[PDB]
């Protein structure tokens, strides 16, 4: 009766359909089943990096038990999910939590073995005493409590392996991350639940696109769920739009209201210099009211036509809604050039010519490399542009790197700029990679690394590349042509969406 | 009346035969007896690594007492097993625990010399107060026999800090058994598992599960890391002797799910998903074929296994630790023979290097390779843009069927001496100490990957001295005392020394930049030979296929003509820059042209575009 | 001395018969102690910083079982501070660690190893030895032995040893080889560059016998149990 107080039930939740379906991953289920049924020391532990699916496997095993697909030695067994915080909640006195846990263990052992224990994140059991989480050792080794567990691949090493007399009683089951083709199947089988939670519909191409697109942009997470987030956010945004009026009318209305409020207060300014700013505010206000009227008129035409066709006879998420989600995330633009960017990209060499005069070849070569990437033609695993341009002084080779970095971002200080005139000695490389573990500045990372990692779309400039020691080129050797360097902490950063630019002054006069 | 309240009875538990055989370990039991039969300070302590067997020795002593093989002054002693976890339980008051302990000690002392207290994991006796200290006077008089057993580390971490205590204790070191002793032990315990599971166990399996777990699984000790293989092979054979076997219970589960997916992908009101259903059904039929064939052959075999064999243990050790340890299941022996021409699908030329790589896999798999040495570690070098990294990525692309499964470090960043702590970790007592190594901690888990050292020459010549034992011994220790196992990976070392000689210049640069004791541990030092204008067409078509697959996301296959496919290889061939000028020329010719075409309308998706060679350029 | 001549396999052969297992020695690889602060791992951290409970790496393996032979691979590549620590092991007998205890190396067999110079008979190599170490640390050791190169006569016995090793390894699948004396002397005739020691013999074995055997074995026709002879051709060894 203490199991009721200090444990919830898992099969009693899987029987009422309150668990999500589990798809694939048969080898791991079979290994867990065949480890959970041996004579002694019969308790596995699902180990692996976070996100790959480790509680989903236990819930799939519970659903399989409820269905009856398990072997004879597991028919009609209840899975119990222990909770340790609720056992340490009130234990002030010197002998409360110990007898609590002992009563729980006695209630488990009293049964004929008709109970399968399940502690998730079992790395939290090494303490909990003050000494506890250690009296379980006699029963673990004898095999009287079948203890399925699951911990991260580096909480094990940090908490359990430090008690090598305990991690002997556990059998490890390595759960690797799935591939894109298996993520597609998982999504296919898992979509009709979000389809119900949000009153929308989800196209299958929108499931292929999520899995194939969240594998090359979001490189900091793993991939049974790195796409489910895209699908969920797309569905939620589409539901919001299915509610009151959609986007890009909801922005212009808010903007016009604010401009009106500002103009109604800037009018009563007894000044001479502020009367000039009130002459542009009204202009932009009228310009915005124009666009808002045009949008609200086109909206009625679309809806009107739809209703007409319905009486005569943008309502489901799509592969571009997924793209808009993954573009609001990470800031990287991967869309379809929605009629506002195509014109700008076509008149590109004419807007760089407003700040750089001449250098037609360089301007054309940069504009021709931005479009090969926006049009979806460039190599998907390489920087979108990496070229070194050089010449005599006062020519424009630093201006162009600052003229290109402007109209792409509407700003000027939005590019990561390091000037290699200070890297004269070869030991200064650590200034862009960090210090290896065990030195003074280590909990700071690199300076280029931790600047590209935060926004992986800015352009990077290497001024005066010739002035550096001839051993930093070797460091750059793999940034180019692959877009990847590491740091002290071991985390890889991807330079696969940035435009690298290296200026220099060699020759200086040669034809 | 408190002993039975707060303890149990090992002798009673063994009289009913609730224990296992303890065959072996004569000297340890003899020493335990002769120390227990002392006059004063008669209390031993079994000590050793976790898993070698330290409670089994006490269980054997109990069985031996019950049998009557002990000397005179041990007859009818009734060993008792104390449980301090119950003494401090609900003792929420001011003196309850102290008085419980005192009553138990008095009850033990009142018996003349019968009770032999046995506290397991006695390191937990230091605290428990708020006590556990009212035992030293009872101990330094010979009145308490206190048999105990703690691991080799928790002893010095908890008890050596109490030098008053450890003086009243005898230490009995229990070393681990060897492979022959492990086999002898296994031959006695097989009956218990043969009874628990309705299965028979073979002696060949018993000896394989001891000679194999000593080689592959090296993180635990070896009276018991061999028992698990038997205990899991038995469970798997029981599950198989149950309703359905395996490798049919996979095809069935896969076909069911494929049907469920096809039944719901058919009514998809789309045009882009039309070719995505045109292969699901193909794969489903190709799977039903194999399902039917296996289900038919099953009836043949059932009209025309029953006990665990020697390869079932191999299958268990292969499911564990990742490593393939089985014996050439069919479909593999054809893959390994096709290897040499299957790698040529991505790497053209360099057939010497291809053969030298495949010959280290076909050997280590057949089982003729050296066990205590990596399965191949060779450094190949040559000019630039030739394929040396492409080969290292294409090798690990069909051993694991996943490009990212390779362990890739690039030695361009290990330019200075102190960057060694970056792939090994920091010593005990510094800032980054929990994260461990970077190369170490990536092999200790899943020890079957391929390791790539890119531009080995760019590193400070003190990092080679760390790889000096990775080669020829396959082991390095991180900043934790954890010797990892490199004996079954494939090491690859790329470089660019010389780049301007046939063989003598590069072999002089190698001997001038490396040490002889380093060049000696290596396998064949392969030298690539540069590309020839003839076989560049086989690279042109691979690049074109790659580009096609890349832009196939919108159904834009190109009909590249033969004169264009020839022009793309006529120029763009440099005898100095390899094949990267070709990659650049492809996007200078087709890339920017199609990019201008595409976003200015007139090339809307679903269309096919032909290329044709103009007088100088080529038009779309 | 030179490379591949038997320096390491002697420290592994002494323990092999003093303990009946080549894994009963404390083999630490001194090629990783190339930094000054790396002394903390083979001695232990001070009381209570990050790793006090772990204790030393060298001192602990001998405080618990003080009869082990201790090997130091590539002592030349260490830092000139671990020598100042290992010094007090000699002419004293004991070693104190960061914990604050004292451990006695009075029953161990210290063994060092290096590859200094490798260019002179004894004069250049012993000058190099006297140049990097300290003379007060050298007059405490026993004989500073120099190992000799291999000769074609001392190589046929090594071929016999390697063939015995290969045969013992092929006992799992129950195979055994028949090596004709022409092949047994050809394998020693080739692979005698007197600059790389005995290593090239291992590679020649795997290239000649092992590769052919492993290509035949999984192509059927050499199924387990039976024996196989090896004979000589103009150049190669046909099986
Ligand atoms: N095989 C699978 N079939 C269906 N859904 C799956 C599968 N694997 C994972 N998922 C889903 O993907 C998500 C993964 O979440 P969890 O598995 O709960 O995270 P986790 O594996 O427990 O990792 P941590 O360490 O606990 S955060 C959940 O939404 C699961 O429902
Ligand atoms: N073609 C050009 N069009 C417009 N401004 C230019 C042009 N060339 C140079 N300038 C001006 O020159 C100034 C600095 O030129 P930079 O391009 O920064 O010099 P640079 O090209 O980097 O040469 P070095 O070798 O680095 S000093 C700015 O004020 C630019 O506006
Ligand atoms: N001499 C032996 N004969 C037969 N079985 C043995 C022998 N020694 C150990 N075993 C078995 O091997 C396993 C070892 O378990 P234990 O000895 O209880 O572990 P341990 O030595 O107590 O180590 P810890 O620190 O308590 S986890 C058990 O299944 C024993 O039954
Ligand atoms: N033999 C080849 N077969 C197929 N593709 C090749 C071949 N040689 C080169 N390539 C291609 O040309 C490029 C060469 O890249 P890598 O082989 O990685 O360069 P590399 O051989 O490592 O030379 P370095 O010294 O690293 S610059 C890649 O895009 C390869 O796909
Ligand atoms: N005298 C010898 N007798 C038998 N085998 C030998 C002898 N010398 C070398 N070998 C073989 O050569 C291989 C390596 O020899 P080692 O003695 O380990 O090299 P070493 O003395 O450490 O030299 P280095 O420069 O450190 S690699 C071993 O596998 C031995 O079988």
Helices (DSSP H) in chain C: which residue ranges? 8-18, 39-43, 58-63, 82-86, 123-132, 135-138, 156-169, 181-189, 199-205, 211-217
Residue located via tokens 């080679």 = B464
**CATH (domain of B222):** 3.40.50.300
Nearest one of C71, C66, C64 to C26, comparing CA atoms:
C71
- For C170, residues 6+ apart whose C-beta sits below 8 A from its C-beta are B368, C176, C177
- Answer whether C34 sits within 8 Å of B417, measured CB to CB: yes
CA angle B399, B401, B404 (to 5 degrees): 100
How far is ligand 2, taken at its centre, from the CA of residue A404, in Å?
A: 14
In this structure, are strands A78-82 and C177-179 parallel, antiparallel, or unpaired?
unpaired
Neighbouring CB atoms inside 10 A of A178's CB total 20
Residues lining ligand 2, judged by CB closer than 6 Å? A 356-358, 393-399, 505
- Residue C214 has a CB neighbour count (10 Å cut-off) of 24
Residue B218 CB partners (closer than 8 Å, separation 6+): B485
Q: Is B191 helix (H, G, I), strand (E, B) or coil?
A: helix
What backbone phi and psi angles, to 5 degrees, belong to A317? -65, 160
DSSP bridge pairs for A80: A9, A117
Place of tokens 């000494």: A131
Ligand 4 contacts CB of residue B384 (under 6 A): yes
How many CB pairs below 8 Å do chains B and C form together?
A: 114
Please report which residue ranges of A329-383 form alpha helices under DSSP H. Answer: 342-346, 360-374
User: Ligand 2: which atom is nearest the Cα of residue A358?
Assistant: 1
Find out whether B128 and B84 touch, Cβ atoms under 8 Å. yes
CA-closest residue to ligand 2 atom 24: A393
For residue C197, the chain B residue with the least C-alpha distance is: B520
Burial level of B369, CB count in 10 A (0-12/13-18/19+)? buried
Q: Is the CB of B458 under 6 A from ligand 4?
A: no
Q: Which residues of C57-90 are buried (b: 16+ CB within 10 A; e: fewer)?
A: bbbbbbbeeeebbbbbbbbbbbeeebeeebeebe
- Residue C115 CB less than 6 A away from ligand 5: yes
What separation in angstroms does the CA of B231 have from each of A73, A488, B276?
A: 15, 43, 45
Helix C156-169 with C181-189: angle, nearest 10 deg: 120
Instruction: Phi first, then psi: give them for residue B611, nearest 5 degrees.
Output: -110, 150
For residue B210, which of B202, B151, A35 has the smallest C-alpha distance? Answer: B202
Reference B146, options B88, B110, B97, B105; nearest CA is: B105
Q: Is A478 on the interface with B (CB under 8 A)?
A: yes
C176 reaches B (C-beta below 8 A): no
C-alpha span between A296 and A289 (Å, rounded): 10
Residues B326, B315: Cα–Cα separation, whole Å: 6
Which among B156, B424, B427 has CB closest to C37? B427
A474 and B412 within 8 Å at the Cβ level: the answer is yes
Alpha helices in A216-270 (DSSP H): 228-242, 250-266
Contact B379, B494 (CB under 8 A): yes
Closest alpha carbon to A148 in A249, A231, A33: A33
Query: CA–CA distance from B17 to each of A42, B197, B223, B433 (Å)?
Result: 22, 19, 22, 49
How many other β-carbons are positioned within 10 Å of the β-carbon of residue B412?
22
Q: Is C162 in the pocket of ligand 5 (CB under 6 A)?
A: no
- Contact list, B359 vs chain C (CB under 8 Å): 211, 214-215
Residue ranges at the known binding site of C for ATP? 1-8
- Please state, in angstroms and rounded to a whole number, the distance separating the CA atoms of residues B558 and B270: 24
Q: Are C216 and C229 in contact (CB under 8 A)?
A: no
Q: What is the DSSP letter of A414?
A: T
Between strands C94-96 and A44-48, the pairing is unpaired
Of A172, C77, A131, the closest CA to residue B319 belongs to: A172
| Nearest-CA distance B261 → chain C (Å) | 40
- What does chain A come to in residues? 511
Cβ B193–A39 below 8 Å, yes or no? yes
**Interface contacts (A, B; CB < 8 Å):** 201
Look at the block and give the residue holding tokens 């567990």: A149
- Looking at chain B from residue 85 to 114, which residues have their Cβ under 8 Å from any Cβ of chain A? 85-86, 88-92, 96-97
Is B476 part of the contact surface with chain C (CB cutoff 8 Å)?
yes
What's this structure's resolution in Å? Answer: 3.3
Interface of B with C in 10-69 (CB under 8 A): none
Task: State the pairing for strand pair B200-201/B307-308.
Answer: parallel
Q: Is B520 in Cβ contact with C34 (below 8 Å)?
A: no
With contact defined as 3+ CB pairs under 8 Å, the chains touching C are B
Q: Do C64 and B152 touch (CB under 8 A)?
A: yes
Annotated binding site for ATP: which residue ranges of A?
48-55, 391-398
SS3 content of chain A, % helix, strand, coil (to 5): 45, 10, 45
Residue minimizing CA distance to atom 1 of ligand 2: A357
- Tell me the C-alpha to C-alpha distance, in Å, between residue B2 and each of B83, B86, B102: 12, 12, 10
Q: How was this structure determined?
A: cryo-EM
**Nearest-ligand number for the alpha carbon of A392:** 2
- B331 shares contact with chain C (CB less than 8 Å): no
Length of chain B: 620
Domain holding B297, by residue range, is 179-319
Burial B258-297 (b: 16+ CB within 10 A, else e): beebeeebeeeeeebbeeebeeeeeebeebeeebeeeeee
Instruction: Give yes or no for a contact between A322 and A210, defined as CB atoms under 8 angstroms apart.
Output: yes
C163 has a chain B CB within 8 A of its CB? no
Q: H helices of C44-155, where?
A: 58-63, 82-86, 123-132, 135-138
- A371, B434: Cβ pair inside 8 Å? no
Closest ligand to Cα C6? 5
Contact of B435 with C52, CB cutoff 8 Å: no
Q: Name which of A486, A466, A478, A373 is nearest A421 in CA terms.
A: A466
CATH class label, A182-328 = alpha beta
Residues of C in contact with B465 (CB under 8 A): 31, 34, 74, 77
C57 → chain B, closest CA residue: B481
**Residue in the structure block whose two tokens are 């100088």:** B616
Contacts for A139 with CB less than 8 Å, ≥ 6 apart:
A105, A109, A145
Residue owning the nearest CA to atom 4 of ligand 1: A22
Alpha carbons within 13 angstroms on the beta-carbon side of residue B289 total: 6
Which of A393, A398, A417, A509 best tests ligand 2's pocket when mutated (most atoms within 8 Å of CB)? A398
User: Do A437 and B421 count as a contact with CB atoms less than 8 A apart?
Assistant: yes
CA distance B546 to B527: 27
Quick one: DSSP state of residue A426? G
B241 inside 8 A of chain A by CB: no
Beta strands B44-48; B170-173: pairing state: parallel
Please give the full DSSP string across A3-72, using - where no structure is assigned: HHHSEEESHHHHTTT-S----S-HHHHHHHHHHTTSSSS--EEEEESTTS-SHHHHHHHHHHHHHT-S-G
A129 in contact with chain B, both atoms CB, cutoff 8 A: no
Please list every residue in chain B followed by a chain break, i.e. its C lies more than 2.5 Å from the next written N: 130, 304
Q: Would you tell me the crossing angle of helices B537-551 and B562-570 to the nearest 10 degrees? A: 120
Q: Is the CB of residue B403 less than 8 Å away from at least one CB of chain A?
A: no
Half-sphere exposure of C83 toward its Cβ, with a 13 Å CA cutoff? Answer: 18
Q: Are B591 and A93 in contact (CB < 8 Å)?
A: no
Which amino acids of A are annotated as binding site, given as ranges?
Answer: 48-55, 391-398
Q: Whose CA is nearest to atom 18 of ligand 2?
A: A398
Residues 80 through 119 of chain A touching chain B, CB cutoff 8 Å: 93-96, 98-99, 102
C-alpha distances (whole Å) from A73 to each of A37, A39, B242 are: 7, 11, 10
Asked whether the beta carbons of A120 and A55 are under 8 A apart, the reply is: yes
Are A478 and B412 a contacting pair at CB < 8 A?
A: yes
Supply φ then ψ for residue B429, to 5 degrees: 120, 20
Both tokens of residue B434? 């929990």
The contacts of residue B228 (CB under 8 Å, 6+ apart) are: A38, A41, A171, B213
Residue C224 sits at the chain B interface (C-beta within 8 Å)? no
- Residue count of chain C: 239
Other C-beta atoms lying within 10 Å of the C-beta of residue B92:
14
Contact A437 B250 (CB under 8 A): no
User: Which candidate, B524, B574, B233, B543, places its Cα nearest to that of B352?
Assistant: B524
Ligand nearest to the CA of C160: 5
Among candidates A34, A164, A443 on the partner chain, residue whose Cβ is nearest the Cβ of B236: A34
CA distance B498 to B476: 31
Quick check: B372 and B474 in contact, CB under 8 A?
yes
DSSP character at residue B521 = S
Structural tokens at position A338: 């929605």
Please give the structure tokens belonging to residue B556. Answer: 């834009």
Rounded CA separation B392/B394 (Å):
6
> What is the distance between the alpha carbons of residues B610 and A71, in angstroms, rounded to a whole number?
59
Q: Which residues line ligand 3 (CB under 6 A)?
A: A 141, 165, 168; B 20-25, 50-56, 151, 185, 189, 223-224
3-class SS at B172? strand
> B47 C-alpha vs ligand 1 centroid, how far in Å?
42
Q: Which two tokens stand for residue A457?
A: 């779309």
Q: Is A398 on the interface with B (CB under 8 A)?
A: no
Are A371 and B50 within 8 A, CB to CB? Answer: no
Are residues C129 and C138 in contact, defined by beta-carbon separation less than 8 angstroms?
yes
* Cβ-Cβ contacts under 8 Å, A368 against chain B: 592, 595
B544 vs A264, B62, B580, B608, CA distance in Å? 62, 77, 14, 15
């Amino acid at each position: 009766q203490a199991l009721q107080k200090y444990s919830t039930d898992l099969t009693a939740r899987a029987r009422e359909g309150k668990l999500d379906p589990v798809i694939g991953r048969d080898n791991e289920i079979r290994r867990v089943v065949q480890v959970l049924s041996r004579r002694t020391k019969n308790n596995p532990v699902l180990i692996g990096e976070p996100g790959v699916g480790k509680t989903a496997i236990v819930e799939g095993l519970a659903q399989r038990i409820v269905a009856g697909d398990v072997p004879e030695s597991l028919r009609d067994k209840t899975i119990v999910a222990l909770d340790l915080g609720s056992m340490v909640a009130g234990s002030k006195y010197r002998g409360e939590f110990e007898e609590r846990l002992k009563a729980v263990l006695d209630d488990i052992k009293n049964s004929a073995g008709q109970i399968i224990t399940f502690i998730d994140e079992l790395h939290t059991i090494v303490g909990a005493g003050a000494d506890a989480g250690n009296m379980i050792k006699p029963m673990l080794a004898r095999g009287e409590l079948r203890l399925v567990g699951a911990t991260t691949l580096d909480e094990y090493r940090k908490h359990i392996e430090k008690d090598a007399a305990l991690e002997r009683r556990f059998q490890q089951v390595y759960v690797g991350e799935p591939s894109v083709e298996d993520t597609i199947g998982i999504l296919r089988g898992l979509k009709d639940r979000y389809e119900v939670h949000h009153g929308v519909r989800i196209t299958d191409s929108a499931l292929v696109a999520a899995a194939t697109l969240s594998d090359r942009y979001i490189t900091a997470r793993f991939l049974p769920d790195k796409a489910i987030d895209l699908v969920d956010e797309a569905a939620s945004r589409l539901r919001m739009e299915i509610d009151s009026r959609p986007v890009e009318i909801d922005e212009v209305e808010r903007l016009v209201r604010r401009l009106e409020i500002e103009e109604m207060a800037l009018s009563k300014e007894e000044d001479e210099a502020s009367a000039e700013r009130l002459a542009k505010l009204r202009s932009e206000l009228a310009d915005q009211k124009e666009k808002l009227a045009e949008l609200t008129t086109r909206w009625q035409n679309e809806k009107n036509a739809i209703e007409i066709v319905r009486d005569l006879k943008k309502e489901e998420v799509g592969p571009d809604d997924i793209a808009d989600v993954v573009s609001a995330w990470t800031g990287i633009p991967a869309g379809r050039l929605l009629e506002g960017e195509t014109a700008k990209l076509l008149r590109m060499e004419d807007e760089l010519g407003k700040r750089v005069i001449g250098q037609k070849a360089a301007v054309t070569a940069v504009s021709d490399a931005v479009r090969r990437s926006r049009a979806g033609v460039s190599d998907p695993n390489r920087p979108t542009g990496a070229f070194m341009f050089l010449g005599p002084t006062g020519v424009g080779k630093t201006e162009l790197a600052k003229a290109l970095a402007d109209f792409l971002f509407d700003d000027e200080r939005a590019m990561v700029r390091i000037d290699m005139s200070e890297y004269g000695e070869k030991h200064t490389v650590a200034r862009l990679i960090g210090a290896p573990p065990g030195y003074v500045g280590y909990e700071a990372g690199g300076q280029l690394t931790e600047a590209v990692r935060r926004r992986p779309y800015t352009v990077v400039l290497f001024d005066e590349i010739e002035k550096a020691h001839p051993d930093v080129f070797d460091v750059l050797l793999q940034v180019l042509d692959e877009g990847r360097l590491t740091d002290g902490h071991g985390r890889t950063v991807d330079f696969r969406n940035t435009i690298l630019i290296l200026t220099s002054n060699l020759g200086s006069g040669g034809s | 009346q408190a002993l039975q309240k707060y303890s149990t009875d090992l002798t009673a538990r063994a009289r009913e035969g609730k224990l296992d055989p303890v065959i072996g370990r004569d000297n340890e039991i003899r020493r335990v007896v002769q120390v227990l039969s002392r006059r004063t300070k008669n209390n031993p302590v079994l000590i050793g690594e976790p898993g070698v067997g330290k409670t089994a020795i006490v269980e054997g002593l109990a069985q031996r007492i019950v049998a009557g093989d002990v000397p005179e002054s041990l007859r009818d002693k009734t060993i008792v097993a104390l449980d301090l976890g119950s003494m401090v339980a609900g003792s929420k008051y001011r003196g309850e625990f102290e008085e419980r302990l005192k009553a138990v000690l008095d009850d033990i002392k009142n018996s003349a010399g019968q009770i032999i207290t046995f506290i397991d994991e006695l390191h937990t006796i230091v605290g428990a107060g708020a006590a556990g200290n009212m035992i030293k006077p009872m101990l330094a008089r010979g009145e308490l026999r206190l048999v105990g057993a703690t691991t080799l580390d928790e002893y010095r971490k908890h008890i050596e800090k109490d030098a008053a205590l450890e003086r009243r204790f005898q230490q009995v070191y229990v070393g681990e058994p060897s492979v022959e002793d492990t086999i002898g032990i296994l031959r006695g315990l097989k009956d218990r598992y043969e009874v628990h599971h309705g299965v028979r166990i073979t002696d060949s399996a018993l000896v394989a599960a001891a000679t194999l777990s000593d080689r592959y699984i090296t993180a635990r000790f070896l009276p018991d890391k061999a028992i698990d293989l038997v205990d899991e092979a038995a469970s798997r054979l029981r599950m198989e002797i149950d309703s359905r076997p395996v490798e049919i219970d996979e095809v069935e589960r896969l076909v069911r799910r494929l049907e469920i997916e096809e039944m719901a992908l058919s009514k998809e009101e789309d045009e882009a998903s039309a070719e995505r259903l045109a292969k699901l059904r193909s794969e489903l039929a190709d799977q039903k074929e194999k399902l039917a064939e296996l289900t038919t052959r099953w009836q043949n075999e059932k009209n025309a296994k029953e006990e665990v064999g020697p390869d079932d243990i191999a299958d268990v050790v292969s499911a564990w630790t990742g490593i393939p340890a089985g014996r050439l299941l069919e479909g593999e022996t054809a893959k390994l023979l096709r290897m040499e021409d299957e790698l040529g699908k991505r790497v053209i030329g360099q057939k010497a290097a291809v053969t030298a790589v495949s010959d280290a896999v076909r050997r280590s798999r057949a089982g003729v390779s050296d066990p205590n040495r990596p399965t191949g570690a060779f450094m190949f070098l040559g000019p630039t843009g030739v394929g040396k990294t492409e080969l290292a990525k294409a090798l690990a692309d069909f051993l694991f069927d996943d490009e990212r499964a390779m362990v890739r470090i690039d030695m361009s960043e290990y330019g200075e001496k102190h960057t060694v702590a970056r792939l090994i970790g920091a010593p005990p007592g510094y800032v980054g100490y929990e994260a461990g190594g970077q190369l170490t901690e990536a092999v200790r888990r899943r020890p079957y990957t391929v390791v790539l050292f890119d531009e080995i020459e760019k590193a400070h010549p003190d990092v080679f001295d760390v790889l000096l034992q990775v080669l020829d011994e396959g082991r390095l220790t991180d900043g934790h005392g954890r010797t990892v196992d490199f004996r079954n990976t494939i090491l690859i070392l790329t470089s660019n020394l010389g780049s301007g000689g046939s063989a003598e210049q590069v072999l002089a640069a190698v001997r001038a930049t490396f040490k002889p004791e380093f060049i000696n541990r290596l396998d064949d030092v392969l030298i690539f030979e540069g590309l020839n204008p003839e076989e560049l067409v086989r690279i042109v078509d691979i690049q074109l296929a790659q580009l096609g697959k890349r832009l196939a996301q919108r159904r834009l296959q190109l009909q590249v003509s033969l004169p264009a496919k020839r022009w793309l290889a006529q120029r763009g061939f440099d005898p100095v820059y390899g094949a990267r000028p070709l990659r650049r020329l492809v996007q200078q010719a087709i890339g920017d042209q199609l990019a201008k075409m595409l976003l200015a309308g007139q090339v809307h998706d679903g269309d096919t575009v032909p290329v044709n060679v103009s007088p100088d350029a080529d038009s779309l």
